[PDB]
């Protein structure tokens, strides 16, 4: 029908025509009204493609509706799922150059696609193969070109009083209280070349050992009760990841002879030994140590505030700075090329908890919008050795805190059956490419809201490039043909013939 | 005289433990007049789990029972240190503790008179109560929101069909925290004069009995067959001609049927003034 001097489309199905009325075909002037958006939203739109059957009508969507909430991208291998995300993320920037986009790239593909755009960054997770090599910083307003990048490790201070307990799993009698007493006292131990000790308020010192040697075993009690009730001297440097193993033993191999004077007994020491074994094992390794920095260094400003500032500083590196402050980059790409399938959940399901905690504090006055892109999320969104839903408590918190405090999520994947059905219910829009199996095409049925069956019964036969869209940003569903990105992502994984021919 | 308890299996004063601990069971030693804190459960648990009999005509602190009791003290400790649980719950004690043996039933019956109101005859200062829960996480809600509806049912029984005043309960997003005894308020409510309004979008996640104890129905658009089938399997007063309309309804239009409608109706609903906040988000503003 007409509104003022144009037309408008309304979806409601109870009307019908009268007998004798004449039937007429539709044109590219009415199709462009059936598949269009409002006028209120037109100056905030983004182009995605063209309609498949006819190919005379272009498709637009509104940034607000599309991204104020969470979004899902699904599809099998080799059908066009990585072109879509680069198209979208680059077209958001080219239109709103004051944006904030963060990308978790676990394959190293999404850097070749942002060549030619300002305020880009590129960080790799690990150590440099070479050592005496340089890395070149860039300035503001400079167009991104490859051959600029940086490296990074993650310290161990930024895992808290709880991450370490979870990572070590004290599963028997007398490991827990000792491992608590050690973490509570780690801020009063001093360090030298290769030995650990304490320093009293007045010069005197006393050594600690890790083998239960009886030398000077008579003053423990009174050199330990003080450390236990906050009486010894403090320090200002973070020690390494082995003072922990050195304290867990001298807190578990102590007793008292009925003859006054303490003794570092041998029986109790065995009740704690295995924790010492494993906490030693996690230093002579090539995987954990390549990513994490278990060496010890930095400031430890007093005030009982030495666990929080590490989190607060590690969050501002990946996710961004508070409002008002000056943040250099606007696009951040994180590369996890070198990261094992074993330490992925533990590490990548803690930065998100950090972000949740900090975003609860910043509030609505100090928080800045950001888009966060998560690739192959069926690898780290469910802690495998967390076999009860009592332990999946990260997405369920971050989604709500973000919906409240301006953080948007994009979830991309190719196996929606290895993914809980409450992750796929907090979404308000859906993009799906061809799915080949029949058990990954029921997990979507079971969990969708705003579709039907005639748009789902034509997903098994979608060609390469074509998709199907529905949700709260589309008036009626559409089958759509996506347009190619220039430049796109990389795909150089491996090819045999070449090497065999060399 | 006094005696001091610990949380760790230390050897200090592990001989005169049973002598002090048997009087505790036999209710022979002293009591107090103030509520203690929450963390103080782990010490009692550890002491009741790590005590054994010694050969030196005394008592001993074992370590083969700590390994049995350990998984519980752990969650207690990790729960008393969260920053999203203690800002809702008050884990500090300090209040008065009465005598007689009825100290739980006077704490329970003082938070119900604050949320759900007092009984008949007394003076209350409000007729409308709006509880806001924007600060409560999405993983602690089921427990704490089912606790309240389990507390509001042990008291209507002890109050009766005489001293009870009739109320109305508006429950929004009820499929998150409404699901034997966990749902007694939907069954034993008509006797104690309480009526529920349940608003929800996923009716397939409710119990077929809650969705059958309802007399009147208001249905807006509903696009999923997994939900239509439930509404139909539970429906009692209607037809199957108005079920086909529910999938093509616009906004503001509804289908209504039950006991207050002599023949089912399709309705267009009036707008409300002043309306609910129902604000939204806008990103283009902050960065443009
Ligand atoms: N509109 C289109 N028409 C024709 N081919 C396209 C179109 N869009 C993308 N393609 C092709 O699809 C091919 C493979 O897409 P990919 O980017 O490998 O998708 P993908 O494999 O699902 O992504 P991953 O999970 O990162 S391997 C590319 O070689 C593109 O040339």
PDB file of C-alpha atoms in Angstrom, chain B:
ATOM      1  CA  UNK B   1      37.281 -22.934  80.056  1.00  0.00           C
ATOM      2  CA  UNK B   2      37.694 -22.791  76.281  1.00  0.00           C
ATOM      3  CA  UNK B   3      38.928 -24.816  73.316  1.00  0.00           C
ATOM      4  CA  UNK B   4      39.944 -23.716  69.837  1.00  0.00           C
ATOM      5  CA  UNK B   5      39.117 -25.431  66.539  1.00  0.00           C
ATOM      6  CA  UNK B   6      41.046 -25.389  63.265  1.00  0.00           C
ATOM      7  CA  UNK B   7      40.579 -26.027  59.548  1.00  0.00           C
ATOM      8  CA  UNK B   8      43.885 -27.844  58.908  1.00  0.00           C
ATOM      9  CA  UNK B   9      44.965 -31.271  60.157  1.00  0.00           C
ATOM     10  CA  UNK B  10      47.579 -29.930  62.558  1.00  0.00           C
ATOM     11  CA  UNK B  11      48.800 -31.878  65.575  1.00  0.00           C
ATOM     12  CA  UNK B  12      48.315 -29.215  68.265  1.00  0.00           C
ATOM     13  CA  UNK B  13      46.012 -30.421  71.053  1.00  0.00           C
ATOM     14  CA  UNK B  14      44.716 -33.553  69.325  1.00  0.00           C
ATOM     15  CA  UNK B  15      44.316 -35.603  72.529  1.00  0.00           C
ATOM     16  CA  UNK B  16      41.421 -33.855  74.309  1.00  0.00           C
ATOM     17  CA  UNK B  17      39.185 -33.622  71.244  1.00  0.00           C
ATOM     18  CA  UNK B  18      36.595 -36.353  71.850  1.00  0.00           C
ATOM     19  CA  UNK B  19      36.150 -35.267  75.472  1.00  0.00           C
ATOM     20  CA  UNK B  20      35.024 -31.849  74.205  1.00  0.00           C
ATOM     21  CA  UNK B  21      33.208 -33.132  71.118  1.00  0.00           C
ATOM     22  CA  UNK B  22      30.916 -35.702  72.760  1.00  0.00           C
ATOM     23  CA  UNK B  23      29.368 -33.045  75.001  1.00  0.00           C
ATOM     24  CA  UNK B  24      28.529 -31.169  71.795  1.00  0.00           C
ATOM     25  CA  UNK B  25      26.395 -34.071  70.581  1.00  0.00           C
ATOM     26  CA  UNK B  26      24.875 -34.656  74.026  1.00  0.00           C
ATOM     27  CA  UNK B  27      23.997 -30.940  74.395  1.00  0.00           C
ATOM     28  CA  UNK B  28      25.734 -30.456  77.745  1.00  0.00           C
ATOM     29  CA  UNK B  29      28.080 -27.497  77.179  1.00  0.00           C
ATOM     30  CA  UNK B  30      27.319 -23.829  76.644  1.00  0.00           C
ATOM     31  CA  UNK B  31      25.422 -21.932  73.946  1.00  0.00           C
ATOM     32  CA  UNK B  32      25.423 -18.337  72.719  1.00  0.00           C
ATOM     33  CA  UNK B  33      23.136 -15.471  71.658  1.00  0.00           C
ATOM     34  CA  UNK B  34      24.505 -14.288  68.293  1.00  0.00           C
ATOM     35  CA  UNK B  35      24.571 -15.716  64.779  1.00  0.00           C
ATOM     36  CA  UNK B  36      28.024 -16.745  63.490  1.00  0.00           C
ATOM     37  CA  UNK B  37      29.263 -16.339  59.903  1.00  0.00           C
ATOM     38  CA  UNK B  38      29.102 -18.660  56.896  1.00  0.00           C
ATOM     39  CA  UNK B  39      32.759 -19.697  56.574  1.00  0.00           C
ATOM     40  CA  UNK B  40      32.533 -21.297  60.040  1.00  0.00           C
ATOM     41  CA  UNK B  41      30.902 -24.467  58.662  1.00  0.00           C
ATOM     42  CA  UNK B  42      34.090 -25.849  57.114  1.00  0.00           C
ATOM     43  CA  UNK B  43      35.885 -26.109  60.460  1.00  0.00           C
ATOM     44  CA  UNK B  44      33.073 -28.102  62.068  1.00  0.00           C
ATOM     45  CA  UNK B  45      32.893 -30.307  58.969  1.00  0.00           C
ATOM     46  CA  UNK B  46      36.641 -30.973  59.008  1.00  0.00           C
ATOM     47  CA  UNK B  47      36.655 -31.747  62.732  1.00  0.00           C
ATOM     48  CA  UNK B  48      33.686 -34.110  62.474  1.00  0.00           C
ATOM     49  CA  UNK B  49      35.367 -35.846  59.538  1.00  0.00           C
ATOM     50  CA  UNK B  50      39.030 -36.066  60.581  1.00  0.00           C
ATOM     51  CA  UNK B  51      38.718 -37.412  64.151  1.00  0.00           C
ATOM     52  CA  UNK B  52      39.802 -40.959  64.994  1.00  0.00           C
ATOM     53  CA  UNK B  53      40.784 -43.151  67.944  1.00  0.00           C
ATOM     54  CA  UNK B  54      44.399 -43.208  69.130  1.00  0.00           C
ATOM     55  CA  UNK B  55      46.370 -46.031  70.721  1.00  0.00           C
ATOM     56  CA  UNK B  56      48.028 -43.740  73.285  1.00  0.00           C
ATOM     57  CA  UNK B  57      44.833 -43.762  75.383  1.00  0.00           C
ATOM     58  CA  UNK B  58      43.838 -40.521  73.659  1.00  0.00           C
ATOM     59  CA  UNK B  59      42.481 -38.993  70.452  1.00  0.00           C
ATOM     60  CA  UNK B  60      44.111 -38.432  67.073  1.00  0.00           C
ATOM     61  CA  UNK B  61      43.640 -36.314  63.957  1.00  0.00           C
ATOM     62  CA  UNK B  62      43.513 -38.640  60.962  1.00  0.00           C
ATOM     63  CA  UNK B  63      44.114 -37.907  57.277  1.00  0.00           C
ATOM     64  CA  UNK B  64      42.143 -40.761  55.665  1.00  0.00           C
ATOM     65  CA  UNK B  65      38.888 -38.943  56.480  1.00  0.00           C
ATOM     66  CA  UNK B  66      39.967 -35.542  55.269  1.00  0.00           C
ATOM     67  CA  UNK B  67      40.255 -37.254  51.883  1.00  0.00           C
ATOM     68  CA  UNK B  68      36.581 -38.234  52.273  1.00  0.00           C
ATOM     69  CA  UNK B  69      35.277 -34.834  53.412  1.00  0.00           C
ATOM     70  CA  UNK B  70      37.483 -32.649  51.199  1.00  0.00           C
ATOM     71  CA  UNK B  71      35.256 -32.048  48.119  1.00  0.00           C
ATOM     72  CA  UNK B  72      32.667 -30.155  50.214  1.00  0.00           C
ATOM     73  CA  UNK B  73      34.854 -27.743  52.194  1.00  0.00           C
ATOM     74  CA  UNK B  74      36.338 -26.841  48.810  1.00  0.00           C
ATOM     75  CA  UNK B  75      33.080 -25.575  47.325  1.00  0.00           C
ATOM     76  CA  UNK B  76      32.193 -23.883  50.621  1.00  0.00           C
ATOM     77  CA  UNK B  77      35.484 -21.974  50.488  1.00  0.00           C
ATOM     78  CA  UNK B  78      35.141 -21.114  46.792  1.00  0.00           C
ATOM     79  CA  UNK B  79      31.570 -19.941  47.456  1.00  0.00           C
ATOM     80  CA  UNK B  80      32.363 -17.717  50.447  1.00  0.00           C
ATOM     81  CA  UNK B  81      34.902 -15.790  48.324  1.00  0.00           C
ATOM     82  CA  UNK B  82      32.954 -14.950  45.151  1.00  0.00           C
ATOM     83  CA  UNK B  83      32.344 -11.269  44.418  1.00  0.00           C
ATOM     84  CA  UNK B  84      28.932 -11.873  42.808  1.00  0.00           C
ATOM     85  CA  UNK B  85      27.420 -14.051  45.577  1.00  0.00           C
ATOM     86  CA  UNK B  86      28.347 -12.040  48.683  1.00  0.00           C
ATOM     87  CA  UNK B  87      26.992  -8.807  47.178  1.00  0.00           C
ATOM     88  CA  UNK B  88      23.545 -10.446  47.143  1.00  0.00           C
ATOM     89  CA  UNK B  89      23.773 -12.655  50.246  1.00  0.00           C
ATOM     90  CA  UNK B  90      24.951 -11.427  53.664  1.00  0.00           C
ATOM     91  CA  UNK B  91      27.673 -13.841  54.819  1.00  0.00           C
ATOM     92  CA  UNK B  92      28.567 -12.087  58.088  1.00  0.00           C
ATOM     93  CA  UNK B  93      26.128 -12.977  60.880  1.00  0.00           C
ATOM     94  CA  UNK B  94      26.143 -10.659  63.871  1.00  0.00           C
ATOM     95  CA  UNK B  95      22.407 -10.770  64.586  1.00  0.00           C
ATOM     96  CA  UNK B  96      20.394 -11.981  67.545  1.00  0.00           C
ATOM     97  CA  UNK B  97      19.894 -15.698  68.213  1.00  0.00           C
ATOM     98  CA  UNK B  98      16.848 -16.643  70.272  1.00  0.00           C
ATOM     99  CA  UNK B  99      16.236 -19.503  72.714  1.00  0.00           C
ATOM    100  CA  UNK B 100      13.682 -22.302  72.957  1.00  0.00           C
ATOM    101  CA  UNK B 101      14.783 -24.220  69.863  1.00  0.00           C
ATOM    102  CA  UNK B 102      12.890 -22.270  67.167  1.00  0.00           C
ATOM    103  CA  UNK B 103      15.639 -20.100  65.690  1.00  0.00           C
ATOM    104  CA  UNK B 104      15.292 -21.142  62.033  1.00  0.00           C
ATOM    105  CA  UNK B 105      11.518 -20.608  61.879  1.00  0.00           C
ATOM    106  CA  UNK B 106      11.826 -16.998  63.077  1.00  0.00           C
ATOM    107  CA  UNK B 107      14.469 -16.149  60.477  1.00  0.00           C
ATOM    108  CA  UNK B 108      12.482 -17.749  57.654  1.00  0.00           C
ATOM    109  CA  UNK B 109       9.282 -15.952  58.703  1.00  0.00           C
ATOM    110  CA  UNK B 110      10.858 -12.463  58.642  1.00  0.00           C
ATOM    111  CA  UNK B 111      11.972 -12.244  54.994  1.00  0.00           C
ATOM    112  CA  UNK B 112       8.554 -13.369  53.738  1.00  0.00           C
ATOM    113  CA  UNK B 113       6.764 -10.513  55.508  1.00  0.00           C
ATOM    114  CA  UNK B 114       9.114  -8.171  53.604  1.00  0.00           C
ATOM    115  CA  UNK B 115       8.631  -9.449  50.041  1.00  0.00           C
ATOM    116  CA  UNK B 116       5.188 -11.093  50.007  1.00  0.00           C
ATOM    117  CA  UNK B 117       3.538  -9.092  52.801  1.00  0.00           C
ATOM    118  CA  UNK B 118       2.019  -9.718  56.209  1.00  0.00           C
ATOM    119  CA  UNK B 119      -1.164 -11.550  57.181  1.00  0.00           C
ATOM    120  CA  UNK B 120      -4.724 -10.346  57.765  1.00  0.00           C
ATOM    121  CA  UNK B 121      -5.509  -7.653  60.329  1.00  0.00           C
ATOM    122  CA  UNK B 122      -2.134  -5.912  60.504  1.00  0.00           C
ATOM    123  CA  UNK B 123      -0.976  -2.642  58.937  1.00  0.00           C
ATOM    124  CA  UNK B 124       1.089  -2.758  55.744  1.00  0.00           C
ATOM    125  CA  UNK B 125       2.546   0.311  54.051  1.00  0.00           C
ATOM    126  CA  UNK B 126       2.195  -0.767  50.408  1.00  0.00           C
ATOM    127  CA  UNK B 127      -0.151  -2.472  47.966  1.00  0.00           C
ATOM    128  CA  UNK B 128       2.293  -2.812  45.031  1.00  0.00           C
ATOM    129  CA  UNK B 129       5.775  -4.321  45.325  1.00  0.00           C
ATOM    130  CA  UNK B 130       8.347  -4.193  42.517  1.00  0.00           C
ATOM    131  CA  UNK B 131      11.437  -6.338  43.088  1.00  0.00           C
ATOM    132  CA  UNK B 132      14.313  -5.562  40.709  1.00  0.00           C
ATOM    133  CA  UNK B 133      17.002  -8.131  39.884  1.00  0.00           C
ATOM    134  CA  UNK B 134      19.259  -6.469  37.315  1.00  0.00           C
ATOM    135  CA  UNK B 135      22.359  -7.096  39.475  1.00  0.00           C
ATOM    136  CA  UNK B 136      21.979 -10.885  39.814  1.00  0.00           C
ATOM    137  CA  UNK B 137      24.043 -13.147  37.573  1.00  0.00           C
ATOM    138  CA  UNK B 138      22.518 -15.606  35.103  1.00  0.00           C
ATOM    139  CA  UNK B 139      24.001 -18.636  36.906  1.00  0.00           C
ATOM    140  CA  UNK B 140      22.942 -17.904  40.510  1.00  0.00           C
ATOM    141  CA  UNK B 141      19.312 -17.105  39.665  1.00  0.00           C
ATOM    142  CA  UNK B 142      17.577 -20.536  39.682  1.00  0.00           C
ATOM    143  CA  UNK B 143      18.717 -21.429  43.203  1.00  0.00           C
ATOM    144  CA  UNK B 144      17.957 -18.127  44.927  1.00  0.00           C
ATOM    145  CA  UNK B 145      14.670 -17.581  43.065  1.00  0.00           C
ATOM    146  CA  UNK B 146      13.363 -21.089  43.768  1.00  0.00           C
ATOM    147  CA  UNK B 147      14.328 -20.733  47.438  1.00  0.00           C
ATOM    148  CA  UNK B 148      11.867 -17.859  47.824  1.00  0.00           C
ATOM    149  CA  UNK B 149       8.947 -19.722  46.250  1.00  0.00           C
ATOM    150  CA  UNK B 150       9.782 -22.717  48.446  1.00  0.00           C
ATOM    151  CA  UNK B 151       9.718 -20.440  51.499  1.00  0.00           C
ATOM    152  CA  UNK B 152       6.391 -18.839  50.549  1.00  0.00           C
ATOM    153  CA  UNK B 153       4.741 -22.287  50.660  1.00  0.00           C
ATOM    154  CA  UNK B 154       5.868 -23.618  54.053  1.00  0.00           C
ATOM    155  CA  UNK B 155       4.169 -20.565  55.567  1.00  0.00           C
ATOM    156  CA  UNK B 156       0.761 -20.403  53.879  1.00  0.00           C
ATOM    157  CA  UNK B 157       0.262 -23.907  55.283  1.00  0.00           C
ATOM    158  CA  UNK B 158       1.148 -22.792  58.820  1.00  0.00           C
ATOM    159  CA  UNK B 159      -0.926 -19.611  58.344  1.00  0.00           C
ATOM    160  CA  UNK B 160      -4.166 -21.096  57.025  1.00  0.00           C
ATOM    161  CA  UNK B 161      -7.233 -20.285  54.965  1.00  0.00           C
ATOM    162  CA  UNK B 162      -8.272 -17.739  57.626  1.00  0.00           C
ATOM    163  CA  UNK B 163      -5.327 -15.420  58.350  1.00  0.00           C
ATOM    164  CA  UNK B 164      -4.178 -15.316  54.706  1.00  0.00           C
ATOM    165  CA  UNK B 165      -4.804 -12.338  52.395  1.00  0.00           C
ATOM    166  CA  UNK B 166      -5.178 -12.763  48.601  1.00  0.00           C
ATOM    167  CA  UNK B 167      -2.342 -11.560  46.384  1.00  0.00           C
ATOM    168  CA  UNK B 168      -1.278 -11.515  42.735  1.00  0.00           C
ATOM    169  CA  UNK B 169       2.147 -12.684  41.525  1.00  0.00           C
ATOM    170  CA  UNK B 170       3.672 -11.517  38.236  1.00  0.00           C
ATOM    171  CA  UNK B 171       6.425 -13.889  37.059  1.00  0.00           C
ATOM    172  CA  UNK B 172       8.460 -12.873  34.007  1.00  0.00           C
ATOM    173  CA  UNK B 173      10.831 -15.234  32.185  1.00  0.00           C
ATOM    174  CA  UNK B 174       9.647 -18.134  34.317  1.00  0.00           C
ATOM    175  CA  UNK B 175      11.262 -20.932  32.290  1.00  0.00           C
ATOM    176  CA  UNK B 176      14.656 -20.025  33.779  1.00  0.00           C
ATOM    177  CA  UNK B 177      13.732 -20.633  37.421  1.00  0.00           C
ATOM    178  CA  UNK B 178      10.441 -22.575  37.569  1.00  0.00           C
ATOM    179  CA  UNK B 179      12.046 -25.825  36.349  1.00  0.00           C
ATOM    180  CA  UNK B 180       8.145 -33.125  43.235  1.00  0.00           C
ATOM    181  CA  UNK B 181       8.206 -30.324  45.816  1.00  0.00           C
ATOM    182  CA  UNK B 182       9.874 -27.661  43.652  1.00  0.00           C
ATOM    183  CA  UNK B 183       6.450 -26.701  42.220  1.00  0.00           C
ATOM    184  CA  UNK B 184       4.032 -26.794  45.153  1.00  0.00           C
ATOM    185  CA  UNK B 185       3.048 -23.131  44.779  1.00  0.00           C
ATOM    186  CA  UNK B 186       1.375 -23.817  41.426  1.00  0.00           C
ATOM    187  CA  UNK B 187      -0.673 -26.691  42.895  1.00  0.00           C
ATOM    188  CA  UNK B 188      -1.506 -25.721  46.498  1.00  0.00           C
ATOM    189  CA  UNK B 189      -2.182 -22.077  45.651  1.00  0.00           C
ATOM    190  CA  UNK B 190      -5.922 -21.908  45.055  1.00  0.00           C
ATOM    191  CA  UNK B 191      -6.501 -23.027  48.645  1.00  0.00           C
ATOM    192  CA  UNK B 192      -4.212 -20.358  50.128  1.00  0.00           C
ATOM    193  CA  UNK B 193      -5.467 -17.574  47.838  1.00  0.00           C
ATOM    194  CA  UNK B 194      -2.581 -16.862  45.464  1.00  0.00           C
ATOM    195  CA  UNK B 195      -2.804 -16.348  41.708  1.00  0.00           C
ATOM    196  CA  UNK B 196       0.081 -16.438  39.242  1.00  0.00           C
ATOM    197  CA  UNK B 197       0.645 -14.748  35.899  1.00  0.00           C
ATOM    198  CA  UNK B 198       3.357 -16.544  33.922  1.00  0.00           C
ATOM    199  CA  UNK B 199       4.945 -14.785  30.946  1.00  0.00           C
ATOM    200  CA  UNK B 200       7.255 -16.749  28.687  1.00  0.00           C
ATOM    201  CA  UNK B 201       8.386 -17.466  25.135  1.00  0.00           C
ATOM    202  CA  UNK B 202       9.589 -21.079  25.456  1.00  0.00           C
ATOM    203  CA  UNK B 203       6.544 -22.997  26.758  1.00  0.00           C
ATOM    204  CA  UNK B 204       8.200 -26.291  25.775  1.00  0.00           C
ATOM    205  CA  UNK B 205      10.537 -25.879  28.776  1.00  0.00           C
ATOM    206  CA  UNK B 206       7.739 -25.909  31.376  1.00  0.00           C
ATOM    207  CA  UNK B 207       6.068 -28.848  33.045  1.00  0.00           C
ATOM    208  CA  UNK B 208       2.882 -30.094  31.319  1.00  0.00           C
ATOM    209  CA  UNK B 209       1.096 -29.645  34.676  1.00  0.00           C
ATOM    210  CA  UNK B 210       1.894 -25.956  35.167  1.00  0.00           C
ATOM    211  CA  UNK B 211       0.674 -25.295  31.622  1.00  0.00           C
ATOM    212  CA  UNK B 212      -2.463 -27.316  32.441  1.00  0.00           C
ATOM    213  CA  UNK B 213      -3.410 -25.655  35.745  1.00  0.00           C
ATOM    214  CA  UNK B 214      -4.279 -22.522  33.718  1.00  0.00           C
ATOM    215  CA  UNK B 215      -7.836 -21.422  32.926  1.00  0.00           C
ATOM    216  CA  UNK B 216      -7.427 -18.510  30.474  1.00  0.00           C
ATOM    217  CA  UNK B 217      -4.885 -18.119  27.675  1.00  0.00           C
ATOM    218  CA  UNK B 218      -3.365 -15.140  25.854  1.00  0.00           C
ATOM    219  CA  UNK B 219      -1.181 -16.062  22.876  1.00  0.00           C
ATOM    220  CA  UNK B 220       0.816 -13.708  20.676  1.00  0.00           C
ATOM    221  CA  UNK B 221       2.940 -14.910  17.765  1.00  0.00           C
ATOM    222  CA  UNK B 222       4.552 -18.320  18.189  1.00  0.00           C
ATOM    223  CA  UNK B 223       6.636 -19.658  15.326  1.00  0.00           C
ATOM    224  CA  UNK B 224       8.044 -23.011  16.527  1.00  0.00           C
ATOM    225  CA  UNK B 225       6.284 -26.356  16.207  1.00  0.00           C
ATOM    226  CA  UNK B 226       8.078 -27.672  19.299  1.00  0.00           C
ATOM    227  CA  UNK B 227       6.021 -25.041  21.170  1.00  0.00           C
ATOM    228  CA  UNK B 228       2.753 -25.249  19.234  1.00  0.00           C
ATOM    229  CA  UNK B 229       2.622 -28.991  19.933  1.00  0.00           C
ATOM    230  CA  UNK B 230       3.027 -28.353  23.665  1.00  0.00           C
ATOM    231  CA  UNK B 231       0.360 -25.648  23.775  1.00  0.00           C
ATOM    232  CA  UNK B 232      -1.956 -28.081  21.988  1.00  0.00           C
ATOM    233  CA  UNK B 233      -1.173 -31.162  24.094  1.00  0.00           C
ATOM    234  CA  UNK B 234      -1.912 -29.085  27.206  1.00  0.00           C
ATOM    235  CA  UNK B 235      -4.881 -27.061  25.917  1.00  0.00           C
ATOM    236  CA  UNK B 236      -8.302 -27.937  27.340  1.00  0.00           C
ATOM    237  CA  UNK B 237     -10.756 -25.174  26.298  1.00  0.00           C
ATOM    238  CA  UNK B 238     -10.535 -24.191  22.645  1.00  0.00           C
ATOM    239  CA  UNK B 239     -10.476 -25.571  19.107  1.00  0.00           C
ATOM    240  CA  UNK B 240      -8.048 -26.283  16.267  1.00  0.00           C
ATOM    241  CA  UNK B 241      -9.263 -23.474  13.998  1.00  0.00           C
ATOM    242  CA  UNK B 242      -7.672 -20.694  16.083  1.00  0.00           C
ATOM    243  CA  UNK B 243      -4.398 -22.636  16.305  1.00  0.00           C
ATOM    244  CA  UNK B 244      -3.635 -21.980  12.627  1.00  0.00           C
ATOM    245  CA  UNK B 245      -3.889 -18.197  13.055  1.00  0.00           C
ATOM    246  CA  UNK B 246      -1.161 -17.982  15.702  1.00  0.00           C
ATOM    247  CA  UNK B 247       1.717 -18.179  13.194  1.00  0.00           C
ATOM    248  CA  UNK B 248       0.703 -15.141  11.125  1.00  0.00           C
ATOM    249  CA  UNK B 249      -0.188 -12.604  13.791  1.00  0.00           C
ATOM    250  CA  UNK B 250       1.277  -9.076  13.666  1.00  0.00           C
ATOM    251  CA  UNK B 251       2.377  -7.047  16.676  1.00  0.00           C
ATOM    252  CA  UNK B 252      -0.295  -6.090  19.184  1.00  0.00           C
ATOM    253  CA  UNK B 253      -2.700  -8.730  17.871  1.00  0.00           C
ATOM    254  CA  UNK B 254      -3.426 -11.720  20.080  1.00  0.00           C
ATOM    255  CA  UNK B 255      -5.641 -14.777  20.359  1.00  0.00           C
ATOM    256  CA  UNK B 256      -7.588 -15.131  23.595  1.00  0.00           C
ATOM    257  CA  UNK B 257      -9.624 -17.997  24.975  1.00  0.00           C
ATOM    258  CA  UNK B 258     -10.729 -19.552  28.234  1.00  0.00           C
ATOM    259  CA  UNK B 259     -13.475 -19.195  30.834  1.00  0.00           C
ATOM    260  CA  UNK B 260     -13.979 -15.414  30.652  1.00  0.00           C
ATOM    261  CA  UNK B 261     -14.628 -15.524  26.881  1.00  0.00           C
ATOM    262  CA  UNK B 262     -17.853 -17.149  25.714  1.00  0.00           C
ATOM    263  CA  UNK B 263     -16.349 -17.690  22.256  1.00  0.00           C
ATOM    264  CA  UNK B 264     -12.639 -17.391  21.359  1.00  0.00           C
ATOM    265  CA  UNK B 265     -11.525 -13.976  20.138  1.00  0.00           C
ATOM    266  CA  UNK B 266      -8.874 -12.284  18.021  1.00  0.00           C
ATOM    267  CA  UNK B 267      -7.977  -9.028  19.744  1.00  0.00           C
ATOM    268  CA  UNK B 268      -6.043  -5.832  19.082  1.00  0.00           C
ATOM    269  CA  UNK B 269      -4.613  -4.507  22.326  1.00  0.00           C
ATOM    270  CA  UNK B 270      -4.566  -0.915  23.539  1.00  0.00           C
ATOM    271  CA  UNK B 271      -1.277   0.885  24.121  1.00  0.00           C
ATOM    272  CA  UNK B 272      -0.253   1.733  27.683  1.00  0.00           C
ATOM    273  CA  UNK B 273       0.486   5.211  29.068  1.00  0.00           C
ATOM    274  CA  UNK B 274       2.973   5.671  30.712  1.00  0.00           C
ATOM    275  CA  UNK B 275       4.645   2.619  29.218  1.00  0.00           C
ATOM    276  CA  UNK B 276       7.498   0.381  30.321  1.00  0.00           C
ATOM    277  CA  UNK B 277      11.056   1.602  29.815  1.00  0.00           C
ATOM    278  CA  UNK B 278      11.759  -1.034  27.138  1.00  0.00           C
ATOM    279  CA  UNK B 279      14.669   1.073  25.891  1.00  0.00           C
ATOM    280  CA  UNK B 280      17.243  -0.284  23.437  1.00  0.00           C
ATOM    281  CA  UNK B 281      20.898   0.181  22.480  1.00  0.00           C
ATOM    282  CA  UNK B 282      22.552   2.382  19.871  1.00  0.00           C
ATOM    283  CA  UNK B 283      26.173   1.982  18.767  1.00  0.00           C
ATOM    284  CA  UNK B 284      26.365   4.437  15.857  1.00  0.00           C
ATOM    285  CA  UNK B 285      26.127   7.349  18.303  1.00  0.00           C
ATOM    286  CA  UNK B 286      29.116   6.685  20.549  1.00  0.00           C
ATOM    287  CA  UNK B 287      31.489   6.238  17.573  1.00  0.00           C
ATOM    288  CA  UNK B 288      30.458   8.416  14.633  1.00  0.00           C
TER     289      UNK B 288
END
